[PDB]
Amino acid sequence: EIFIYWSKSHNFKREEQNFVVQNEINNMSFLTYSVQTSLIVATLKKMLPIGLNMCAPTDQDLIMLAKTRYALKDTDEEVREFLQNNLHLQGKVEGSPSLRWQMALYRGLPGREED
Amino acid sequence: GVEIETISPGDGRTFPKKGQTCVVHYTGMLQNGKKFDSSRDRNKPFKFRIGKQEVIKGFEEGAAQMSLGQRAKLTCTPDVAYGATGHPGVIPPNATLIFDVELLNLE
Amino acid sequence: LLLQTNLINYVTSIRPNIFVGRAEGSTQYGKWYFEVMVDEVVPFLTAQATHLRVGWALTEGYSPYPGGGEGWGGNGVGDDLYSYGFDGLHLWTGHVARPVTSPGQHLLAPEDVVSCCLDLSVPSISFRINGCPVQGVFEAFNLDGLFFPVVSFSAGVKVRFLLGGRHGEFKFLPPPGYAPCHEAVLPRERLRLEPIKEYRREGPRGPHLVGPSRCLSHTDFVPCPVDTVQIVLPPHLERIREKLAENIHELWALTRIEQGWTYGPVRDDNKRLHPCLVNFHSLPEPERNYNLQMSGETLKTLLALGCHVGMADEKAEDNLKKTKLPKTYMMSNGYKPAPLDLSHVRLTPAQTTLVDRLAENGHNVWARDRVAQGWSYSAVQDIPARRNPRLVPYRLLDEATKRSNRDSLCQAVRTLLGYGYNIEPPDQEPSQVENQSRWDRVRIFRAEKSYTVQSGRWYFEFEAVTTGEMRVGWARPELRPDVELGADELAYVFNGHRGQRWHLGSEPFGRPWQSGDVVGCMIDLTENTIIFTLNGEVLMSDSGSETAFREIEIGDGFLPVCSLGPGQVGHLNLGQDVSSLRFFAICGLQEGFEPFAINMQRPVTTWFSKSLPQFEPVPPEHPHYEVARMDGTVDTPPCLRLAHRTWGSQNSLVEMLFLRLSLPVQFHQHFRCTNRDDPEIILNTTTYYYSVRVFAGQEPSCVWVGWVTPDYHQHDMNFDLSKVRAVTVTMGDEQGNVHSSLKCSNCYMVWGGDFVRISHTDLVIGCLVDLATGLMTFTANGKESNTFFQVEPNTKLFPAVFVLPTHQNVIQFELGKQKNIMPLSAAMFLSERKNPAPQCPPRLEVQMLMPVSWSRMPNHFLQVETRRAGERLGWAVQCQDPLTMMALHIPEENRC
C-alpha cells in the first residue's frame, strides 16, 4: 500500500528528494542520490519475495494478465471481478513442465496450506 | 608348433579323447597384442569335435593337452594356424595367434 | 589407421597409508615386508578376465585415473614405470608382462599368500607366492619419491592386507632383516586403506569433489637443522651463561618430586628416584658442564636463528627469589626447587614461535645424531635393533612429544625473558616447499560443453566442505585447463578463502566462507549479470552493488565451473533434485532463477582438468614457439625447425620444452639373432636415421636428443638423464643364477653436453635404430658416441628432443639419410618401406608436452569396501559389482 501510494503521487517524490538532500542520508550504509536508492523501493525490493511466496506458480499467469489491467489504469476495486470474470486462468501442472517442478516446491511448503 | 602355458590348473586327469566335443570359452589375440575374437563377448561356449578338423591345427593339438577345467594359453605359429594366406580382413598373413582357452566341459 | 574400440573393465587400486623411502641421512629403515591373502576371485565376472595384481608403487607419478589410459586401459600395478606388480604368472612394469617361474605357477587364486619385499638398499623388489620364491626380481630402479604397497583389482575380488603385528600375522616369517609394514605408520596418522589420488569420493548428500592431496616427499624424513658450530660466543651470552644453565639442570626433576620418583641420598639420577634437586655439583662433572654448554648451545641456536638480547629494566636477580615449597622438600642437603626458581614472568608470541623452532632444532639435531649412529624409525621401539618411534623430523612428530619438547625450552626462554634480555625475532622470508609443479595444485571441474547456457536464468550450489582455496562460478566453454580460474577472461568465479571476485584478475568482494557454507551461484542472461549468495544471503561488493559481475556478453555461452586446491573438498549440487538444494528458496526461487540441471534425467556429465602430461601438437598460433616445415633442397633434407618467437623480448618464456614427432617407429616382432648407395644393401637394410641440428647460440648442454616410448608423461622442468625412468627386470633360476636382465625405460636419450672452445658451429646429433636387432646408436658430429641402447621386440619409439631455449633459433629436426641407411619416413609409413628419398608428409609434425588436459569424469565409479577384518585377519578389500567401459584406442600413440 505504501508503495502504490508512492508511485501514485508526484510532488511526494520531490519532497522525498528534498528530505534526502537537506538531511544528507547516506541511503547505502542503511541498506547494506537517485530514486534507485530510495528506502521505499529498497524496502519493497527486500520484502517482495515474501509477498510472491503466497502466490503459487499456477497464479503466475493470472498476474501476467492483471499486468494489463493496471496498465490501462483500471479501477482497483473492479480488478477483483476482472479476476473472477477472468477465472479460467490457472493452468495445468502436468501440461506445463516447468510448473511440474515449481508447483512441487510450493506444494511442499508447510506454511503453504492448500486448505 | 603350439606352445601350451598353464594359467590355472584343471584336473590333469581327463583329457579330450578323439570324438568328444569340447566346450571351450576363449579369447584370441595377434601376437602383437590385439584382439580378434572372444567367445565370451558372444556369450556362448564354442563346441568342436576333436578329430574332424573343423578348427585350425594348433588349436587341435593344443586343446588336447589341456584337461577338464584347465585354463591355458596357446601360441599357434602360422604353420599350425592359418598361415601365409590369412583370414582376409581378420588376420594378416604370416601371423602367430595367442589363445586364452578354458576347457569347460567335455561333450 | 582406424580408431579401435573395445569393452574394458574398470580397474582401481588400494594402498595402506604406509610410505617408505630412501635418501641421504633419511630417518627410515630400508627393508620392508608385506603380504596379501587372496580370499575370493571370480575369474571371469565380465568377458574380460578379472584383474588382480599386487606390488609396490611410487608416490611421484603412480596415479591411475579411472577409465582410459595407456594401452587398452585398465591401468593397475605395473602399467607405468612408477609401479612394480605381480599377478602370479607375470611380473608387470612399464605395461609389459614378463613371465616368472614359481613352483606351481598360476594366476592369483583363492587361498593364496603373496609376500612382497623391498630392499631399497640395492634397490630391489622380491616376491614369494605361498611361501615359494618367485624367480624374478625388479632391480636398479628410481629411488626418488616414496614407496607404498598397492593392490590393483577389477571387480570380483576379495583380498586381505597383512601388515604384521596387529594388522595381520603374515602366515610366513619375513625373510631375515625385514621390517613388517605396520612399523612405518607415522606418529600422527592411523593405519588405514585408501585409494591413490582421487578427484571424487562419495558423500552424505552426494558426490564430493576432491582437490589434489599433499604426499610426503622423501626429503621430509631427513632432519635438516641449522648448523651450530660456526658461532663465536658473544659477551652478553657468556654473561648470562650460568642462570640459563642453572635453571635447566634439574628442571625435568621438578615434576616428580614428592611422588614415587622422589630422590634419596643413597642413589642419584636415573634410579627411579631421579630428582636430586640439590645442585649439579653433586651431579657428575662431565654431564654438568655439558648441561652448562647445552644452555649455551640453545643460545647458540638462538644466535644462528637470528635472536639477539638486550637489557633494559630492573635486574630480575633482585626481584626474584627461591621458594622452599612444602612440596619438593628433601633430606639431602636441604630442599629447594629442582631448577632455578622464577617469579611472575610472561612471554610474547614472538617467543612462542621462537621456542617452537628452537625445539625443532633440538629434535632435528638429536635425530640426525641418532641416524648417524645407525638408528631408524619404527612405530614400535626396538633398542637392541636400534630403532625408535621418535626418529622423525619435528614436523612429523606427534603433538604430545612436540609439547613435551617445547615445555623445556619454553621454561628456558621464560627464564631468559625474566632477566629482561630481549628475544629478537629474525627477519621473515616467505618460502614455498614445492614450486616446480605449479600444475599439481588445482583441479578444475566444469560441466560438459553440451550444457552451455546462452539464455534464461540459472542457479547451482556449491558446498565448501573445507574452507580453503576453492573457486566457484561460471566459465566460457573454451576454458583453458592450465590457468587459474578468473586469471584470464574465460571465467567469472568467486574465491572464498578470502572473499574475492575473479575475472581477468582479482577484486575484493564478499565475506570468506567457513566449513559447511553453501555458495549459490546464479546467472541472469537477460540482464547479463552474475550473483553469488553465501548461505542464502546475497554477497555485496563494497560499492553496494548486488551483482558480482554485470554487462557480461552472452557470447558462446556459460558453464558451471569449480576449482579445488590442494587438500580441498567440495560438493557441487547442480540441482537435478530441487529438494537437495538447501538455500534455493531463500534466494533464487522467487527471483525467477531455475536450477541448472532441472530435467537432466541423467546427472550432468562433468570434465576435470587431468594433470597427466600428454603430447599435443604445437598450436599454429602460439605466443612463443613456432615450427617451420622447411622442405628439402639438394644439400638439405626435409626439416621441421623450431624457433622461439619472443626471445629477448620482455614476455619471453624460457622453460624446458619436451618436443616429439607425431609418429613412432616400431621394432620388428622377431629379431634376426635367433654418398651414392649400394642398391642391394639399402633395399635390404633395417637401419634408419634422423638428426637434430642444434643451432649456434643454443647451448648444447641444454639439449637432449633421442627417442621416447609412447608412455613418457614427465613434464619435469629440471631435466637430466638421471631423472629418466628405469628398471631392470632380472629372471633367474632356482639357485638365483641369472637367465635374463632386461633393462626398461621410457626415454632413450643423449645429452648434447657429452659431445661438447667457442660455440659458433651447430651440433648435428644423429640417431640410428636397427629395427631388426633392437639396437640404438648416436653420432655426435660424425663421430660415433659410446651410448648404445637395446630394446626388446615390437617397441614403439617416437623421435624426441628436450630443449631449454637459449636462442631464438633453438633446434631443427632433420629427416635425412646416411649412406646405406634409410630415412625415418621409410620406417614410419608402410608405403615408403623401400623408398630411399627422405620425405616429410603432413602427418609428421612436432608435438609438445602439455601439463594438463581436460578429461571426462566417469558416470559410475567402482564401489570398494575396506574394513579391518580383525587383529589376525588384517585389512580386507572387496569389490564385487562390475563396471565396464567402451574404450577407444589411438593405435599410433598406444593410448585409450
Side-chain angles (χ1 to χ4, degrees), chain C residues 758-813:
Chain C
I758 176 58
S759 174
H760 295 105
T761 58
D762 310 333
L763 198 68
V764 188
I765 304 161
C767 298
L768 291 88
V769 287
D770 190 357
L771 296 197
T773 317
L775 190 148
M776 302 163 34
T777 305
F778 304 85
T779 70
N781 214 354
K783 185 180 173 283
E784 278 89 313
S785 79
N786 283 9
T787 69
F788 61 87
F789 295 119
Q790 178 76 45
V791 293
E792 44 165 17
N794 217 356
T795 55
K796 282 172 165 118
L797 279 171
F798 302 74
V801 177
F802 298 159
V803 57
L804 184 143
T806 316
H807 201 237
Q808 67 267 10
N809 281 318
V810 176
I811 59 167
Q812 176 193 55
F813 280 98

Side-chain angles (χ1 to χ4, degrees), chain B residues 1-98:
Chain B
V2 55
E3 271 206 359
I4 193 167
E5 303 299 340
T6 185
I7 296 169
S8 296
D11 283 28
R13 192 173 32 60
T14 65
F15 298 73
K17 303 322 171 193
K18 237 47 114 128
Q20 249 155 348
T21 324
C22 289
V23 211
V24 267
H25 237 323
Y26 71 94
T27 304
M29 315 209 158
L30 296 173
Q31 203 184 130
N32 64 7
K34 292 164 165 321
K35 210 194 47 143
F36 57 95
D37 211 19
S38 7
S39 216
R40 331 177 132 279
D41 295 10
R42 299 183 251 122
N43 246 265
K44 256 180 0 154
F46 167 76
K47 316 190 176 53
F48 72 97
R49 284 221 41 211
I50 184 168
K52 297 312 178 276
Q53 283 84 320
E54 293 179 353
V55 291
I56 53 182
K57 202 179 162 205
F59 204 87
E60 183 178 1
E61 69 275 16
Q65 320 183 41
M66 293 177 71
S67 314
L68 183 63
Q70 170 168 333
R71 185 173 159 210
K73 186 177 65 73
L74 317 167
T75 316
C76 319
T77 177
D79 291 331
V80 301
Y82 285 114
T85 187
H87 202 95
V90 186
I91 292 163
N94 285 303
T96 285
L97 313 176
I98 308 94

Side-chain angles (χ1 to χ4, degrees), chain A residues 28 32 49 52-53 100-101 105, chain C residues 542-543 578 589-590 594 599:
Chain A
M28 177 158 136
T32 73
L52 306 182
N53 198 4
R100 176 202 44 167
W101 70 261
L105 293 173
Chain C
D542 291 311
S543 69
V578 186
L589 178 48
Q590 284 89 5
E594 293 183 353
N599 298 304

Side-chain angles (χ1 to χ4, degrees), chain C residues 323-326 328-334 337-500:
Chain C
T323 78
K324 195 265 181 184
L325 294 191
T328 74
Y329 157 71
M330 294 299 291
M331 61 285 288
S332 85
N333 193 357
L340 200 153
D341 202 299
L342 177 60
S343 54
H344 60 278
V345 168
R346 282 81 186 177
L347 309 91
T348 67
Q351 284 72 355
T352 74
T353 80
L354 185 144
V355 68
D356 181 275
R357 44 171 191 301
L358 177 64
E360 189 192 276
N361 182 81
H363 190 52
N364 286 9
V365 167
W366 171 85
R368 171 174 70 181
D369 293 3
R370 280 303 151 74
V371 162
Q373 292 107 28
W375 288 48
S376 298
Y377 174 52
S378 66
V380 291
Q381 193 195 110
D382 306 319
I383 293 305
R386 299 182 297 86
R387 307 182 71 196
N388 209 16
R390 287 182 310 276
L391 280 163
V392 297
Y394 203 59
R395 260 177 50 258
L396 300 176
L397 212 54
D398 51 320
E399 277 73 358
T401 315
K402 289 185 199 289
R403 184 175 297 111
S404 79
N405 290 108
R406 283 180 298 212
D407 274 322
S408 165
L409 301 203
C410 198
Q411 300 301 109
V413 65
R414 198 191 62 178
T415 51
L416 194 43
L417 278 173
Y419 279 33
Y421 287 83
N422 293 29
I423 296 304
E424 289 294 338
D427 282 351
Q428 278 63 232
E429 296 91 331
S431 293
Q432 192 78 40
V433 178
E434 154 193 4
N435 290 78
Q436 174 178 310
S437 191
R438 58 204 314 167
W439 298 283
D440 297 306
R441 294 251 161 111
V442 166
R443 270 179 187 154
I444 311 164
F445 316 86
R446 75 159 165 74
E448 201 182 68
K449 291 174 183 181
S450 298
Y451 300 98
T452 179
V453 287
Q454 296 174 345
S455 72
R457 294 183 284 171
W458 302 112
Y459 180 94
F460 83 90
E461 260 168 14
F462 164 76
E463 176 181 330
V465 179
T466 61
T467 175
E469 172 90 341
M470 320 177 265
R471 304 172 198 192
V472 63
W474 300 88
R476 298 198 185 282
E478 64 278 55
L479 192 53
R480 300 299 299 164
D482 46 7
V483 298
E484 314 263 356
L485 272 73
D488 59 351
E489 66 279 335
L490 293 165
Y492 311 145
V493 304
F494 172 61
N495 171 19
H497 202 191
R498 74 214 56 71
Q500 280 194 136

Side-chain angles (χ1 to χ4, degrees), chain C residues 231-241 244 295-296 298-313 315 351 354 358 412-426:
Chain C
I231 294 89
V232 291
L233 191 154
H236 44 76
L237 292 202
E238 61 203 17
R239 188 272 328 161
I240 197 54
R241 187 168 170 80
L244 274 294
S295 167
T298 62
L299 300 172
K300 285 160 78 64
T301 304
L302 296 191
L303 291 173
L305 262 53
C307 191
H308 313 274
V309 305
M311 191 305 288
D313 205 290
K315 301 295 187 292
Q351 284 72 355
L354 185 144
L358 177 64
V413 65
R414 198 191 62 178
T415 51
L416 194 43
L417 278 173
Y419 279 33
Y421 287 83
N422 293 29
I423 296 304
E424 289 294 338

Side-chain angles (χ1 to χ4, degrees), chain C residues 846-860:
Chain C
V846 184
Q847 301 179 336
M848 65 179 288
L849 200 41
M850 298 289 172
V852 183
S853 172
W854 289 109
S855 294
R856 204 164 172 287
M857 273 189 64
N859 309 104
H860 301 296

